[PDB]
Design a binder for these strands. Sequence first.
RNA 1: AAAAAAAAAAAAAAAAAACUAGAUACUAACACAUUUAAUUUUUUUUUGUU
Length: 128
Amino acid sequence: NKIQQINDKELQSGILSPHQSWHNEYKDNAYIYIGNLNRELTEGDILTVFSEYGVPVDVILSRDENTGESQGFAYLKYEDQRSTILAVDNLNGFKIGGRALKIDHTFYRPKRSLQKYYEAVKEELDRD
RNA sequence: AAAAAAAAAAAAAAAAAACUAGAUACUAACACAUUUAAUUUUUUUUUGUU
């Protein structure tokens, strides 16, 4: 609802196409921060809503090291960037499970401690 | 220009109020297009990763 507020102003001026859009600030980014998730949605189900706008190559759900349950945020890289422009813009502010999730562009830095979680995820997304 | 008179009835201290609706004049240099670049409507069960 912070970002959703911008695009309405922006589109109203007829900004139309990325060169003039703030989404142009990125261009080298693909992962999207996915916020305000519900707690029970897992990686496979976050890999439900987000293929509407593209083809995910990677995904990471943030979850406590001990109890292993959702922190409530994820980082999902689309194969073709412009999905990111599409997901951030279009699906931000949308309700799942009563709470409206947030998306925004992100630069994502991998953490050693999850290293196995990368192949464990990749192998599934490597199936396709 | 100009040269009077005379025969014992009256007097007066100068319409409202209320009700309900309608009719028309009028009063305040009243206000009538700019208003928006520091500052509080922005609210949620804390939860954005070398």
